[PDB]
């Protein structure tokens, strides 16, 4: 994992998006492409349409998934069996 001195990494795009989203206390679906951004306690209510490679899948954050990255909840490869 990332070193603690550098601190958590969040892209500026969705960071600004969530600051303007939470300043009026309503959470609309936020369409993002940055699967590398970690989850901050500022995301607890917001629903993210994280990219997958083909489409954007809705991700609703909770308390538990803080500290993970948005990409962990958008599975890329699809496998059903042989």
């Amino acid at each position: 994992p990332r070193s603690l001195k550098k601190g958590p990494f969040v892209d500026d795009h969705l960071l600004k998006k969530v600051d303007v989203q939470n300043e009026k206390n309503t959470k609309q679906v936020i369409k993002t492409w940055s699967r590398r951004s970690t989850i901050i306690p500022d995301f607890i209510g917001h629903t993210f349409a994280v990219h997958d490679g083909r489409k954007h899948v809705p991700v609703f954050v909770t308390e538990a998934m803080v500290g993970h990255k948005l990409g962990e909840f958008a599975p890329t490869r699809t496998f059903k069996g042989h």
């Binding site: 958590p8 308390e63 538990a64 998934m65 803080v66 500290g67």
Partner: peptide
């Protein structure tokens, strides 16, 4: 709670 652990790590 995970949020507490974040506060420990980064604060």
């Amino acid at each position: 709670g995970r949020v507490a652990r974040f506060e420990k790590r980064y604060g």
